Structures are given as structure tokens and as C-alpha cells.
């Protein structure tokens, strides 16, 4: 019966919590109470990229630490040369309601998606000398919140229909469908090994998926509101979540529970984006109070504040070499900080 | 900008910089309106001449040297709070209410309260359309305006009943810098884009006066 199956679910939930409490011998702050703090990180705006005339919702560094694509409500993707502050390309969009963008690791493609429920792939390197649409991926029911390239042929998309998908670009069909979330999926982070990825939805939960067989492995629940951002640790054995409850939390897969929470009494605004440094010691998070906060991932203490934006910081990104951090915001400008 | 190829890259960037200017300039003349309301409430038929350009439906029509862009969000059967900030820059909001749908009118009141008091739409004006006015007069003859509002102590006529519903919707407005506009049109008023045009023209004057510091 419905009641009979209800009791079994409660017992499984209680059993999981019993195992969770059994492996919590000491909190991470207890073991990390005897190493020197980072001090006070003071980064400065080294570049200011101008040319967008609306809110910026997404950006992504290329795998060379020099090229980055930015998406804005003006219906255009602009590829920047961050070194020279140059516009390599300007790609008009069929739909101006864009909320995500991705840069292919090979550098030959970019991704775009939003309220049109469609992920669009653009071929940057063409014999005709112009950027053209290579594929239009359809099948999602709700708005597309995030997309991340795996290779030139596979992409993973998160949508507002409580579902993530894996696509074959050449075929244009969903190879795998990921189901289990109760709320809208908002963020999506790919593991360095590409065999796993984690997503955070509006049900105040995060789920770890494997692209090989497409079944949820772990479910994390420590937040009180919508999860807006997620990103893997460089090790690939941990990830960080930013939420609307003005809190950041760090989860570990092998321990399978929360390790550290990042909050302050003076912060009452949700997190829009999260990112790690090259070594994972610094956790950079964008907030709704017009600022980006730098966190000590091992100390849960603020080490610096990035305050140069006149509107909400909606984007974050750390280069592959860790030299620069680029921050996009609703003020139509995005800056590079090092 | 020293080598020969570096100079040609800067010239390409300046050419792209130029084209961004006209595209933004050309988009400035556009008027963006957000259509809201309950399902099957005349939302898609507010203007007879509206022509479409399943997430978002964009409809465009130029009335008098003024391009209007209308966006309908009804296919996004999801959490509105995660994508409603994309329309924070709209000129006004067009809300449609069925005066005939008694059952759906309380849902309209709840929907109307949220949009007025949403943190993004605190200074965004709202044009209110009361549809099905012709059927409302025929409907009140059989079913009176007591089932929807038990607290209605007034005449059972048409004009008096219409004002009570309009007053309730305007009660949800609290900020004094929004200027809700009300209009009644059911199915046959062909001139229904003029009222939107007049309301938008009124809205821009108030915005200009505030920008000029006079208001």
C-alpha cells in the first residue's frame, strides 16, 4: 500500500542519517585549526570588458585562459580576448532570453540556452569566416539553466523541468535522461574526469550523477532554500553549493555529507555563482549585495571582497591556469581580477 | 597593438564595436511589455493585429511609429521566481482578468497581488484589462456577484458590480509610484492597442519627469 511503502522510505532515510552520524568523528574545522590562514587577499580590476548593453547571465573561460564567451540579454554572444580586450566574435542570438553559455574544450564550439528551452551549438571555425549555428537541441520542457560541453559531440544540459540530459550533437537526440529532482535544476558542474557530474536544484538538494549509466549515486541535503550555483573541487572528490539562504556549503562524496558551511551574520543575500581557485584553497562566490566574496575553503572565514560592480554579480570564472578571475554582473560590464 | 596582425585585430574589434552600437540603438525604440493573467483570459487576443514573430511567445506590432514587443509567459510551468527578473526592464505589465470566470477570479487576485508586490516590479506600471465585460452583464442576471465575494453589500447592477472588482484589484497596489491603469474590453473593441499606447506614453512621461528631477 501507499502507507506500507511510506514506512520503508522513512526507515531508509533514518538508516542513511545513522551512517552519516557514525562517520563524523570530528568536524573539518577541528582538524584545520592549526595551519596558517591565507591572510587578506587583495585582488584588483586588471581589465574591464565593455560592449554589452544588458544584463549578463553567463560567461565561460576557454581552455587557454585567454578566450571567454559572455551571454547577455541583448541577444548576442561576445567572445573576448582578455589579454588585449578585443572582440574576436559577436554572435547574434535567435532568442534574447539567455541564461547559460559554455565554451567547448577544443575551442571550436560555444553553447547557448535559456527561456527558449533550446541549447544552440555554434561553429566558431568555418571555411566561410563566420560563426553559424551547428545544431539546435530540443526536448527539454522547462527553461535551460546550464549546459557544459564534454567533447565536440556530447553536452549535458540542466533544465527547469527537474531533469538533466546528455546529448549527441551530431544525432541531436538525448542519449541519457536524468530524473529524480523535485525542483528546477539551476546549476551543473562537470568533474575533471568527465565520468561524473553534480547538479543543484530548487528542492534544496544536490545529486551526483554518472554519465556512463545515468543513475543517481548520492543525494545531499543541507540547505534551506534554492540552490543556485555548484562547482567541483579540483580534486574531484568534493563540491561547493551556493544557495538563496545566503550560505555556501561544502560536500564530500566519499564521506557523503556536509563538511563546512560559509556564512556571516551581515550577509542576507543569496549566492549567484561559485568557483574554486586552482588549488581549491580559495572559494569565490558572487552575491546579490553587488559584491563577490572570497572564502577560505579550509577556515570558513572571509579573506577578501571583490567590490567593483554596480549591480548583482551573476557570473564567476577562474581560468585553467588560475591566473585570473572574471566576474560578470547585471551592470552590463564584466571585469578581470588578478 | 604593435605587429601588423595585431593592428588588424584591433580594427576588427572596432568594427564589431560599431555594429554593437546600431543594434543597441535600433533596439532602444522597442517597447517591451509583459503579458500576464490566468489561462484562457483573452491574453493572446488583446490586440487584433498582433502577429507572432514553447517556452516564451513573443508578439510584435507597430502601432504609431512605435514598435511594441509583447511576451507571453504561460508555457513556463515552473517556478516563476527563477526567471521573472529577466523582465525587470519592461515598460509595463498587461494583466488580463476574466470578469465572467468567477472561479478563476480569486486565482487572478492572488496572481495580481504577487506581481504588484514582487521586488523587481516595484516601480513597473501595470495596465489592467477587464475582459468578458459583455458576458459579465449576461452572467450577473443568473448568478449574482456574491459567490465570488460574499462581503459585497451593493447593487446587483452591471456598473456597480464592475467597480467593486476593479477596486479590489487596485487595492493590492501599495507603492505610490506605479500608477495602475484600468480598462474594460471583452471581445469587440478593435481600438485596444490605443489604450496600451496611451498608457505607455503616460508611463514614459512620468519616468522622464523623475529622471529630470521634477517628480
Amino acid at each position: 500500500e501507499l502507507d506500507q511503502l511510506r514506512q520503508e522510505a522513512e526507515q531508509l532515510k533514518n538508516q542513511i542519517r545513522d551512517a552519516r552520524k557514525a562517520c563524523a568523528d570530528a568536524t573539518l574545522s577541528q582538524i584545520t585549526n592549526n595551519i596558517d590562514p591565507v591572510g587578506r587577499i587583495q585582488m584588483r580590476t586588471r581589465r574591464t570588458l565593455r560592449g554589452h548593453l544588458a544584463k549578463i547571465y553567463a560567461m565561460h573561460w576557454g581552455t587557454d585562459s585567454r578566450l571567454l564567451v559572455s551571454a547577455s540579454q541583448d541577444g548576442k554572444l561576445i567572445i573576448w580576448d582578455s589579454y588585449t580586450t578585443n572582440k574576436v566574435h559577436a554572435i547574434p542570438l535567435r532568442s534574447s532570453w539567455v541564461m547559460t553559455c559554455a565554451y567547448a574544450p577544443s575551442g571550436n564550439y560555444v553553447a547557448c540556452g535559456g527561456l527558449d528551452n533550446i541549447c544552440s551549438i555554434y561553429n566558431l571555425k568555418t571555411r566561410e569566416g563566420n560563426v553559424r549555428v551547428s545544431r539546435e537541441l530540443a526536448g527539454h520542457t522547462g527553461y535551460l539553466s546550464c549546459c557544459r560541453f564534454l567533447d565536440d559531440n556530447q553536452i549535458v544540459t540542466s533544465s527547469g523541468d527537474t531533469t538533466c540530459a546528455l546529448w549527441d550533437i551530431e544525432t541531436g537526440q538525448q542519449t541519457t535522461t536524468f530524473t529524480g529532482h523535485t525542483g528546477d535544476v539551476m546549476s551543473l558542474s562537470l568533474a575533471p574526469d568527465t565520468r561524473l557530474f553534480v547538479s543543484g536544484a530548487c528542492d534544496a538538494s544536490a545529486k551526483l550523477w554518472d554519465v556512463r549509466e545515468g543513475m543517481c549515486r548520492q543525494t545531499f541535503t543541507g540547505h534551506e532554500s534554492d540552490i543556485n550555483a555548484i562547482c567541483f573541487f579540483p580534486n574531484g572528490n568534493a563540491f561547493a553549493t551556493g544557495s538563496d539562504d545566503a550560505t555556501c556549503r561544502l560536500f564530500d562524496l566519499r564521506a557523503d555529507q556536509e563538511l563546512m558551511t560559509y556564512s556571516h551574520d551581515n550577509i542576507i543575500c543569496g549566492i549567484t555563482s561559485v568557483s574554486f581557485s586552482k588549488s581549491g584553497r580559495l572559494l569565490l562566490a558572487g552575491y546579490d549585495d553587488f559584491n563577490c566574496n572570497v572564502w577560505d575553503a579550509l577556515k570558513a572565514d572571509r579573506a577578501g571582497v571583490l567590490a567593483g560592480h554596480d549591480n548583482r554579480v551573476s557570473c564567476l570564472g577562474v581560468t585553467d591556469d588560475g591566473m585570473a578571475v572574471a566576474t560578470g554582473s547585471w551592470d552590463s560590464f564584466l571585469k578581470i581580477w588578478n | 597593438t604593435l605587429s601588423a596582425e595585431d593592428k588588424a585585430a584591433v580594427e576588427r574589434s572596432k568594427m564589431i564595436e560599431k555594429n554593437l552600437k546600431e543594434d543597441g540603438i535600433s533596439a532602444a525604440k522597442d517597447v517591451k511589455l509583459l503579458l500576464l493573467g490566468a489561462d484562457n483570459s483573452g491574453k493572446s487576443t488583446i490586440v487584433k493585429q498582433m502577429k507572432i514573430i514553447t517556452g516564451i511567445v513573443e508578439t510584435h506590432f507597430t502601432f504609431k511609429n512605435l514598435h511594441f514587443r509583447l511576451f507571453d509567459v504561460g508555457g513556463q510551468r515552473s517556478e516563476r521566481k527563477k526567471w521573472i527578473h529577466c523582465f525587470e526592464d519592461v515598460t509595463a505589465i498587461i494583466f488580463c482578468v476574466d470578469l465572467s470566470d468567477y472561479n478563476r477570479m480569486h486565482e487572478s487576485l492572488m496572481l495580481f497581488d504577487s506581481i504588484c508586490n514582487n521586488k523587481f516590479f516595484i516601480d513597473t506600471s501595470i495596465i489592467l484589462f477587464l475582459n468578458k465585460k459583455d458576458l459579465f452583464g449576461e452572467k450577473i442576471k443568473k448568478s449574482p456577484l456574491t459567490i465570488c465575494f460574499p462581503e459585497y453589500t451593493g447593487p446587483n447592477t452591471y456598473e456597480d458590480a464592475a467597480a467593486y472588482i476593479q477596486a479590489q484589484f487596485e487595492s493590492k497596489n501599495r507603492s505610490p509610484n506605479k500608477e495602475i491603469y484600468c480598462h474594460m474590453t471583452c471581445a469587440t473593441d478593435t481600438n485596444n492597442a490605443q489604450v496600451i499606447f496611451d498608457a505607455v506614453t503616460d508611463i514614459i512621461i512620468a519616468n522622464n519627469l523623475r529622471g529630470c528631477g521634477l517628480y
Epitope: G129 | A4, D6, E11, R12
Partner: single-chain antibody, 231 residues
Framework: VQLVESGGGLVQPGGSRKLSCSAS????????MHWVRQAPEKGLEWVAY????????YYADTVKGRFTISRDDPKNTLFLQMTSLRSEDTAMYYC??????????????WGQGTTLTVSSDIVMTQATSSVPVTPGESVSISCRSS???????????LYWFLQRPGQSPQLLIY???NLASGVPDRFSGSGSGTAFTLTISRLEAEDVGVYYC?????????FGAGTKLEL
Amino acid sequence: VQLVESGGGLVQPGGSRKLSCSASGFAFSSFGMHWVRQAPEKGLEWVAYISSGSGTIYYADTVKGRFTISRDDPKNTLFLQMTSLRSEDTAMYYCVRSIYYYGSSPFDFWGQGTTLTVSSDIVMTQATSSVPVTPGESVSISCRSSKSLLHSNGNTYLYWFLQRPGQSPQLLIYRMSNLASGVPDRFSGSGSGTAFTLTISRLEAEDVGVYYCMQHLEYPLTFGAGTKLEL
């Protein structure tokens, strides 16, 4: 992608002639355009350059004041107005497309030009002229430069072109080390400042011809004498 040249023929000395090239298959509004000569028994020679948007225009020292370069983007055509023709202007004129951004491949496409009968600068040196090779051996082609082509931005500007008999030259390597689209991976280029080489591993047919080294560090653009491989 197709560039077709028109004009040329028997022109008496002191006359005028207009050469036109029609572009089809690509976007003729984002590509810089070039003119390159080739004397009947000599190497390539740069003539003129017009940028996208007709902003920057350059000429060689031997054609300045006599040659004019212009384009009409809506008509997808490039022009070269030549006045006061001399006996030294008798050559085959090639139209070359070129795009310029981060990671571009300039001088990617050439068009089969039209012959014409009329009857400091960086010095590029290719001492080797004729080299006999076998179908399967590995050969190296060397080029020399008077100046150091390495720039302060880490980009050194050397170009390698192959001109098979009865064909227009095609790009093999751009910027001393970069392979062009459609070029087999056996071609490889390497070198340093004022010293360059091009390696062709596992030489076979269709690799015979004249190889030219060209510098894009600054205008005017200078070519080499040409290294000819013979089977």
C-alpha cells in the same frame, strides 16, 4: 570558397588596365584582401592590401602612385586599378583572402589569377633552389630573415606556401608552427629568430613544387626566391 580573377591581356606600355576578382562561397566583408604578382620566371611579389571596411590600404614601393586597390562588398568583388604600365608589370596577379583575429589563418585561400603582358624591407633568403627528392624520403626547406620575426607578444610571423605546377599557391604553415586546414599532418615547421625550416616527412606525390617563405611582421610583405622540389 571561390575567388575568380578577370582582366589582363596584351596591354601596350603606358596604358591602363583594371583587374577584378569575384568572391563566392565566403563572407566578403570580414576578410582582408591582397594582390600578389608572379613574374613568368620569378617568385611571388606583394602588391597591395585593403582591410575589412576599407580602413587601411597599403601598396608596394614599386606600385605606389600607379596602382589603386578598391572593393565593393555588396557586389562581392575586389578591384585593382593600374595606371602607367611598364614592362616590369608583366606577371600573373593573384587575389588572396586574409582574416585577422586571435587564432586566425591569414592567406588561407588563393584564386587562379589572370596573366598580364605589358610589352628597410625585410629580406627573405632561400639559398636552396632545386632539391631532388624521392617518394618516401624526408626533406627540409630552410628560409632566412634579415630581421628577427619574433615579436614581444610571443607571435613570430613566418608563412609557408606551396605552388604546384599550373596551380595557385596554398598555405601550409602560418606563424612558423601552425598547420592549415586540409594540410596533411606530415608537414611541420620550426625555427627561431632569423632562422627557419620546414620539414616534409614521408614525401610523396602532390608535394612537388616551389615552396615560398613570407613574413607578415610589417609591411611591405616580402617573399623568398623559392625552393623547388624535383622528383
